Design a protein around this ligand. Structure first.
Ligand code: HEC
Ligand code: HEC
Ligand code: HEC
Ligand code: HEC
Ligand code: HEC
Ligand code: HEC
Ligand code: HEC
Ligand code: HEC
Ligand code: HEC
Ligand code: HEC
Ligand code: HEC
Ligand code: HEC
Ligand code: HEC
Ligand code: HEC
Ligand SMILES: O=S([O-])[O-]
Ligand SMILES: O=S([O-])[O-]
Ligand SMILES: O=S([O-])[O-]
Ligand SMILES: O=S([O-])[O-]
Ligand SMILES: [Ca+2]
Ligand SMILES: [Ca+2]
Ligand SMILES: [Ca+2]
Ligand SMILES: [Ca+2]
Lengths: 520, 520, 75, 71
């Protein structure tokens, strides 16, 4: 059985913790629930750590007193189809392979599934670690609780004796790097300096061997990613988000200085050897929009190239850990701001961006966001009980599974069927425009080899390549974003119509140039 | 009412039957249930048949005493979508038409449905008989019991006065030949010599007019295909399977000599005029893996061409009735072994194999097969009754309809939803790789006209054609096979990654050659 | 060695989660999988219910007859 | 928000509770979750209760850490 430790002894050296812990709703929660610090206490001095204390990062550390939230969180939604490839005629992006050719996502890009699996799915996806990590067997794919208990309880490593990124299966890629993991786990929270910069106190950084880093990590989406374990107050821990909101002064709601002020973030820094080491962002309110934006954003977490001169931007560069914190119509300017693109298209040669799940940036300025609605209202609402103590559901999933609490409490005029119909109207319309955008992108892409082989000039090809950047951006935002337009239907419609406009312009340009070469 | 005949009188000339019948569980079942032999008995001699006895081939001959198994067998699974074309974006092979161009399956290749319909579906499919045979009207498509009663009770013939294979509808083919029927019916069991070789006692052979043959056949999947009617013991009757297992000494489990010995087959031959005529294979055990492998295999049942010199291999050749009895990674060697390919691709000119439903060969070496599981355990399990005499379900269908008996009795740790999720994980992953394999195959195929028109050398084109053979094989195995990877997920993944590797190699080869011709 | 809680407040079974003991003390009819069938693998839910009812029906018949005779005496 | 009390101070006069509390699975659960003893501690001796401390009997005293069982 746990025996409490004297927190006062701790507080004598840990004033920041004292100020948070003594004031919040965890004032009675003893340090022993999460820390084993006996040898630490025997050896530390005022400013030197001595022996390192053990810190529990497992979610069961919270489950002891918060079983309801834990159980809600680890639930697996079986209806969320597993390992479902997006590049298929029945999924999100029927022409993805042609459009993304040259990027690592061509190796595999599946639809998301339940949060319990985020770390194991990151480890096993074909694009990440060359097939190095796999489930112990095909049965383990169901085991949400097991994944939560630890990735390495359900996965194998093809070669424990090497630590280099390489392909163990022919059609895999090795795109994973240490920045990825910040959106899968925060087990490394005490071993990673702010932004993944080099730091004497950091075991891991942007430049680490990711296979070695991976083996040190176990748990998905730790409860403390949104809740400070000392104060129990709302927070974020994701460095890239703090950097955008605070360091770059953009605010929690970049479009709304008033809301940004009312619902802001305070950056709190922790030091090692009296030098800044790590940071968190304490929230003024329990604002899920900002909590979820730790991960559900467009980001850089990868090497790339400069737009200016095409030179390599490596993991060592700060730009390899970057939140653009920009909506689709501000994105091109945001990418120019850091002089960055992701890949060159394998067929057209165009410099292109790679877009990822920008739910937070898409939601901005939507009717629901402007009305003060937040992710949790639709995706993790309060539980309604005929008799019971209310708690917040932690099963982050589609509102279709809980329409009464997600939608109909606000929309009293509608039945469930009518609310579903309204969602489907938007999704169906948006998907049709996504498909049409892909059709026009593919038509343009297919003209590039014809143009080059007909002797069309580099000047015309480069014009078309500039059009490709825009056509790609205004399309891929929407295959990347998970709501199929629902989060901001007017924006999706304007963006996708712009993509088609750009592709059509490029098609006409190339067809005309080709025809002129044929006429001599 | 039936009157019993004196079996002892029969046994005086039929010693083989006596040895089987007197010993097995049909020792009390009188010959009159299946044979009308009055005139036969009056005219036969020790070694000459005299007047031919009537032998019932209808399944209702067994239904009289085995109603439960019969009723189970004739059940129609309405949820198994009928006449569903595989070459569509929502089915198995979205790019099938491009990839299979040059083969008869381009005319129609539907998903399989319930066993009751196998013979009528064979007769009516657009690729088989030039549209000659059709259901009497569109209502008959539902009539499983009617099809079982006899194909000609539900079908019409566009021209009873001719017997040549020809097109009655413009977009049909005439691919059917007498070998096909061996996997649809065994009504011809006494009229077909082993392998379909020419034989004085055989009415029908590989070289017969298939339209004439068709008119003589009525019943699907006769009960006696798996059960000897005389001994009631387990057997196979399919010549091609006996040939692979016994004549070629490959064994029932070619990968496992021990299991092959424990679960083997004994070839029993029946003679006409003291010359070998037909054969069956008696099984040591009631092994559904081998019973189902009578049909659910990759086979040759068609003319083709030699790999060596491209010369025609006709129905007269033994190779027109061939079970390769080889897994995907042994197939190319198996096809080289008999010097055979199926068709030349209409666009690329490559010699290609045609793969068909290799469930048996795919299942070999899988985790379930190695653990002693067999087709019937998942597809035709014992019925569970609160009160009753247990019998084996004969409704061969997906385990999704009976998960408790097919999966969960073995997998106690899982709910139905978890077991379904595990299946879908594998199927979703495999389908994504199938789609990607098709993308790369199509990309390569489309480069062939460009290459030929740019004046790329025959040497380079032939290199690409050799790559096409392998890319095609390692893809088509999996659109042909019905489990979408479930029967052997690691093998599907390795094979499909190989297909993509081959296509990518060919694409690079052709693109480079084209570009060199453009640069002069 | 069976106790009240085994039938009236059994452990919750979850596909994924931390097990806890149900504190809803109620008839096992509402949770037959966990209250009965985990021990009685030979039975379906309907068979287990049928066995309960056989006993309850029989006992209640004897209760009613006992009351009939008591009332006859009292009168 | 609840502020923890010095349980060791309590234990100087409550050895019977000490022997139970320090050993079981509530060793880390502070007295303030169920007792309001500020005035008691101001006035008690080991042989004189002084002001009577308040003890919570409501089930929500447990529901705070054991919501699943309470619900
Ligand atoms: C779980 C409910 C915890 C309780 C109770 C206590 N701590 Fe904690 N602590 C916990 C986590 C998950 C972390 C990682 C960092 C994060 O912000 O999540 C920490 C970290 C610390 C640190 C390091 C801060 C730094 O300099 O980087 C200290 C000094 C610390 N914790 C002290 C501490 C004390 C004294 C506690 C008893 C009053 C205590 N913690 C309780 C989780 C939990
Ligand atoms: C028992 C020893 C606990 C441990 C372990 C954890 N928490 Fe806790 N938590 C506990 C109590 C008694 C309370 C106060 C309840 C009340 O409403 O009075 C809390 C509260 C929280 C809250 C709400 C905070 C707020 O609204 O300001 C959160 C978000 C919370 N606790 C989170 C949390 C996390 C993430 C834990 C693991 C690191 C964790 N708790 C452990 C008791 C206990
Ligand atoms: C936070 C800014 C993230 C970064 C850094 C990485 N990922 Fe991610 N990932 C994130 C979210 C919010 C989601 C779900 C939404 C969605 O559109 O998928 C994911 C999903 C994945 C998945 C599962 C789906 C799939 O594409 O197969 C995988 C396998 C995955 N992510 C891998 C991955 C890699 C390799 C990363 C570094 C290059 C990486 N992620 C970073 C959020 C974030
Ligand atoms: C960000 C993605 C979160 C993660 C990770 C965790 N929780 Fe959470 N929690 C989150 C929100 C948006 C809320 C509601 C806040 C509001 O006031 O609207 C909560 C709330 C809690 C509470 C308070 C009681 C309740 O409302 O249920 C607790 C005790 C709590 N959360 C616990 C908890 C646990 C145990 C987690 C790991 C399994 C966890 N949270 C993660 C957002 C997020
Ligand atoms: C209600 C007004 C919502 C708000 C607030 C948020 N989301 Fe949403 N989301 C909503 C709908 C109707 C849908 C489509 C779901 C469906 O079943 O059709 C979605 C979708 C998502 C998804 C994908 C879920 C899935 O398909 O299984 C994600 C990952 C998602 N939304 C994230 C998300 C974020 C991060 C939010 C705050 C920035 C957010 N949602 C708010 C409705 C609503
Ligand atoms: C149905 C339950 C039957 C019973 C009863 C009997 N026979 Fe049979 N017989 C039956 C079938 C379907 C066939 C076709 C071949 C096959 O293996 O399925 C036969 C065949 C024969 C033959 C021919 C063997 C040969 O030389 O090719 C003979 C000589 C024969 N049957 C004899 C026979 C006798 C004597 C029976 C009474 C003891 C008898 N059969 C019963 C189906 C059934
Ligand atoms: C009644 C006159 C029958 C006819 C017609 C058919 N079968 Fe039969 N079968 C019959 C009996 C009395 C038995 C023995 C039952 C027992 O378990 O004691 C059988 C048995 C079988 C079996 C099981 C054999 C074994 O396990 O070794 C099979 C597979 C079987 N019968 C098949 C079968 C077939 C295919 C029939 C049509 C050709 C057929 N039976 C007719 C009685 C009668
Ligand atoms: C009476 C008002 C009818 C209605 C309502 C439906 N059906 Fe019908 N159908 C009817 C007749 C008299 C016939 C012809 C019978 C014959 O054998 O000549 C039919 C035919 C069909 C067919 C066959 C079509 C073909 O081209 O051969 C089909 C597939 C069919 N009917 C189906 C059908 C369906 C699905 C209906 C509900 C939408 C339906 N029918 C209504 C009479 C009437
Ligand atoms: C045994 C080795 C067979 C040979 C010889 C033939 N077929 Fe076949 N067929 C077989 C199986 C096991 C299945 C179901 C599994 C599947 O993948 O389809 C089929 C299916 C058909 C169908 C229905 C599905 C379809 O493709 O439309 C038809 C119409 C069909 N088979 C026709 C057919 C022809 C024309 C054949 C000779 C060229 C032939 N079959 C031979 C097994 C076997
Ligand atoms: C191969 C594809 C089969 C066909 C054709 C028929 N049956 Fe069958 N039968 C098959 C199997 C795999 C089994 C189970 C054997 C085992 O011991 O596991 C059976 C069993 C029977 C029996 C025995 C009693 C029982 O288990 O139900 C009988 C009487 C029987 N089968 C009858 C039967 C009938 C009437 C058929 C035509 C409608 C028929 N079988 C075809 C495999 C196959
Ligand atoms: C359990 C371990 C199985 C074994 C043994 C066999 N099959 Fe199977 N099969 C299995 C699954 C989970 C599926 C997918 C079904 C679904 O609904 O997703 C299949 C599929 C098939 C099919 C197609 C069925 C359909 O889609 O309707 C066929 C024709 C098939 N399997 C044949 C087959 C053969 C011949 C087997 C022995 C060699 C065999 N299966 C074994 C599970 C299992
Ligand atoms: C007994 C006759 C079984 C049947 C019926 C089903 N399964 Fe099975 N399965 C069985 C065993 C003994 C094992 C191996 C256990 C181990 O850990 O070694 C399996 C394995 C699986 C797997 C993993 C496959 C892999 O390649 O790793 C899966 C996904 C699986 N089983 C699923 C499954 C399904 C969906 C079934 C119903 C169609 C099913 N099994 C039936 C034993 C038996
Ligand atoms: C007697 C009628 C009880 C009442 C009053 C309460 N609980 Fe209980 N509890 C009881 C039993 C029989 C058990 C299972 C013991 C075993 O090991 O089999 C429990 C268990 C708990 C636990 C431990 C964790 C768990 O198994 O769920 C807790 C934390 C718990 N009970 C809490 C609790 C609460 C909050 C109560 C008031 C709402 C409560 N118990 C009352 C029996 C009885
Ligand atoms: C948070 C500050 C708590 C309060 C308030 C209550 N309990 Fe508790 N309980 C808490 C913890 C951290 C634990 C240990 C969890 C573990 O297993 O590590 C417990 C445990 C129990 C148990 C199980 C004890 C056992 O020996 O198995 C029970 C039955 C229990 N708690 C009951 C209980 C009651 C009745 C409460 C109101 C008087 C109560 N707890 C409050 C944390 C907290
Ligand atoms: O404690 S030391 O820093 O004097
Ligand atoms: O690759 S992750 O960003 O989905
Ligand atoms: O019966 S005859 O062969 O002599
Ligand atoms: O054509 S048959 O083999 O499916
Ligand atoms: Ca999903
Ligand atoms: Ca990006
Ligand atoms: Ca089917
Ligand atoms: Ca073939």
């Amino acid at each position: 059985n746990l025996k409490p430790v004297d927190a006062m002894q701790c507080f004598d050296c840990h004033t920041q913790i004292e100020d948070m812990h003594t004031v919040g709703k965890h004032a009675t929660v003893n340090c022993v629930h999460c820390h084993d610090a006996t040898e630490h206490v025997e050896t530390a001095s005022s400013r030197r750590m001595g022996e390192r204390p053990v810190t529990r990062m497992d979610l069961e550390a919270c489950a002891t007193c918060h079983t309801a939230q834990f159980n809600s969180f680890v639930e697996v939604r079986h209806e969320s189809h597993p390992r479902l490839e997006k590049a298929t005629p029945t999924s999100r992006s029927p022409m993805f392979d042609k459009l993304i050719a040259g990027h690592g996502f061509a190796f595999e890009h599946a639809e998301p599934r339940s949060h319990a699996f985020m770390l194991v799915d990151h480890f096993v996806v074909d694009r990440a670690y060359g097939g190095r990590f796999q489930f112990k067997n095909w049965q383990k794919v169901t085991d949400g609780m097991g994944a939560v208990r630890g990735a390495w309880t359900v996965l194998t490593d093809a070669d424990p004796e090497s630590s280099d990124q390489r392909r163990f299966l022919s059609q895999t890629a090795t795109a994973a790097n240490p920045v990825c993991l910040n959106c899968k786990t925060q087990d490394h929270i005490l071993d990673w300096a702010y932004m993944g910069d080099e730091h004497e106190a950091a075991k891991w950084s942007r430049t680490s061997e990711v296979v070695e880093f991976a083996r040190d990590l176990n748990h998905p989406l730790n409860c403390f990613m949104c809740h400070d374990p000392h104060s129990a107050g709302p927070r974020v821990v994701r460095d890239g988000l703090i950097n955008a909101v605070v360091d770059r002064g953009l605010g929690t709601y970049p479009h709304d200085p008033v809301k940004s002020e009312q619902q802001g973030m305070t950056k709190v820094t922790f030091q090692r050897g009296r030098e800044d080491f790590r940071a968190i962002g304490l929230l003024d309110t329990a604002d899920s929009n900002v909590m979820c934006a730790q991960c559900h954003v467009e980001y850089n977490c990868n090497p790339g190239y400069q737009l200016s001169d095409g030179s390599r931007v490596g993991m060592d560069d700060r730009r390899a850990n970057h939140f653009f914190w920009a909506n689709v119509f501000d994105y091109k300017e945001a990418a120019q701001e850091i002089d960055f693109f992701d890949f060159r298209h394998a067929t057209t040669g165009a410099a292109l961006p790679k877009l990822q799940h920008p739910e937070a940036e898409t939601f901005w300025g939507s009717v629901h966001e402007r009305n003060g609605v937040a992710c949790a209202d639709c995706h993790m609402p309060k539980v309604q009980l005929e008799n019971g103590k209310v708690y917040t559901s932690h099963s982050q999933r589609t509102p279709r599974d809980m329409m009464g609490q997600a939608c109909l409490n606000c929309h009293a005029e509608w039945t469930e069927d009518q609310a579903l119909y309204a969602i489907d109207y938007i999704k169906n319309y948006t998907h049709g425009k996504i498909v049409k955008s892909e059709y026009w992108l593919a038509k343009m892409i297919d003209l590039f080899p014809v143009a080059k082989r007909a002797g069309v000039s580099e000047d015309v090809l480069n014009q078309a390549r500039e059009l490709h950047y825009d056509a790609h951006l205004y399309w891929e935002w929407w295959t990347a974003e998970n709501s199929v337009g629902f989060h901001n239907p007017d924006q999706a419609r304007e963006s996708l119509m712009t993509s088609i406009s750009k592709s059509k312009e490029a098609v006409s340009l190339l067809n005309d140039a080709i025809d002129a070469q044929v006429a001599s």
